[PDB]
Design a binder for these strands. Structure first.
Lengths: 8, 189, 190, 8, 8, 190, 189, 8
DNA sequence: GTGAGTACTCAC
DNA sequence: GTGAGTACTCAC
């Protein structure tokens, strides 16, 4: 999987 | 997208060593680069500002585990990814993590921690959903209680969400993960 | 003597209570003792000190016992249980002091106080490093998983229970069915 | 068997 | 010549 | 603009009224300005950054008005007299800011603010010593009394008249019966 | 006289660089070496402490100027000593000279300024007297108003001391004074 | 004439 | 801008 | 020991 981030 | 620039400003703030202290609606605007009146003519309070941040965890985690299940079927694998899913989402969003751990929720109204308890309540029963489906998949169930099985693991994750906080993001959760793994794997006995 | 150790009580009585989630103000802290906001400062120089004494207590207690688990128990493996029961035994027994242990009560206070707890959690993880480091010293066969990557995992588990002990307004007691959770842990002494 | 209880 | 005042 | 000055008016009135003897607490001062104590901290960070502005006002009002003197009449006598009427005329036209000048109003405040008025005092006296030295040039004649000594005796009188304006509760005017005094001050001018 | 020490402790505190700041009954009770309960078993309020200290000022200065007007019959030499009793007394008593100037009493009842106000008013009168007598002792009246010359000399005397305190007692009053007096009698006509 | 010194 | 705290001082 | 000021805050 890939883990998403808020720091777009 | 002004209702996504404030949030971004706030998220970064919880990461700065000013995260330990109470984030005021004053120094929030300063960092954003606006007035306090350019904040409240949107959000009716801080609670909504933080609620909009709670969501991104619920979504980028709950729906993300559910996605694992659909795609990944093997149990030992599923019971690993979910763990990585936790410790991973942390190190990548330490701002959001102080929210997860609860520390940065000591300042806001208590309804928010309760809504964080729920997040944990769901992912725990979801862990219990992967544990149940071992019999149906592999003719056999775990010798240990599932309710206490999952909880035991979720215990390990919060205590790795805490040590990341205590030290100010030096005790990273995703460090030595190929190593830590057989230990909790050996728990799944 | 008394005046000091009678307000620390009241402070703890708040930390455990429903208000313990909020900042503990000078105003409200007087309400428990019933005295004036000034009367407090006649016995402490600051509210910060009220939280340093608390921390000394936790630091003197858990650590006395750890230096008391060795000089009474050499069983390389039984040790941990006594430690892992000591820590989780303190929590359940001390709801308010746990809220400082976790570090939620520290939020309304100064970062200086956090170092204390860490430096405690780091003297505890060092007590643990020892217990298990000493294994081969006892029977020519030690471990495979590195002892520090272990000590962390062990104490990592604890900070999780102590967090649930708090964020559930004290409904998830750490000692509960410790006997069942334990063979899972001891299984990690590989 | 000796758990130091702080409070009353 | 002219001594100013702060108050009007 | 409209508001970052109204506040100073209220500080001023309180500073030359009955309450100049006490300190102008933000709560007291608020009631004057006519807006809550919180709206006071919307223009200035601290109480001390209010007085600081009130000082700078003086820091210009005297020196700027003196540079003008030096350029309009170059006779030292006529000049040494216009400057004396300045510091006196000001202190009397502004009762409030004189409590500041004499560093009495600053007692309730930071000692730093004094450090600024002492310098204000320097320049005034430092200006004096110059005028004396210049008279040797416009008309080949000077004084027989040391310029510094002579300068530090005038200031004395002016500093001494302001201290009576204050402690008499603004009863004893400084520039009152001036035209009779200055002939006495001009007597030590030789 | 275990009451004297307290006043001595009040002086030594009014003489230090903390004199520009309030003297708490706390950090006052500290010096003498007792509690704020024994402070008030010798004095009713903090006022009496200043009252007694001020009272010594009155006497001391008043008993000396009197003494001068008796053993010294010279009109000139008269105030040549009187102006030295002052400026001399200031430089001798650093702390006390804050009571005179009106910096120290800026914390207590205004009634304590009145005490001092009367003292100057009394000093300025017995000084005015010296000017008046010059007539009956020499026939030649003054070429300048007696009250006007009187005040004018006090101004210098409340200025030298005000400059004294302002610079924490660095510009000592009586320094270069023998060269300073000729600027005062220079008004005696 | 001597100036008194209270600060003994 | 403000109603409402906000840790700590002061004279008694 | 305490009632009362004490400069300055924070969320709305």
């Amino acid at each position: 999987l890939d883990i998403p981030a808020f720091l777009r | 997208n002004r209702r996504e620039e404030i949030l971004q400003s706030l998220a970064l703030m919880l990461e700065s060593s000013d995260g330990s202290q109470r984030i005021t609606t004053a120094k929030l605007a300063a960092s954003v680069g606006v007035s306090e009146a350019a904040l409240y003519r949107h959000f009716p309070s801080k609670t909504r500002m933080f609620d909009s941040l709670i969501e991104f965890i619920e979504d980028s985690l709950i729906t993300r585990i559910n996605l694992i299940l659909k795609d990944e079927k093997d149990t030992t694998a599923r019971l690993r990814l979910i763990v990585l899913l936790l410790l991973g989402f942390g190190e990548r969003n330490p701002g959001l993590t102080r929210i997860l751990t609860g520390h940065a929720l000591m300042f806001e109204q208590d309804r928010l921690q309760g809504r964080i308890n729920q997040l944990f309540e769901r992912i725990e029963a979801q862990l219990r959903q992967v544990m149940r489906e071992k019999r149906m998949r592999e003719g056999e169930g775990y010798t240990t209680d599932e309710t206490l099985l999952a909880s035991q693991i979720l215990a390990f994750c919060e205590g790795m969400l805490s040590r990341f906080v205590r030290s100010e993001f030096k005790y990273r959760p995703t460090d030595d993960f190929d190593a830590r793994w057989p230990l909790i794997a050996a728990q799944l006995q």
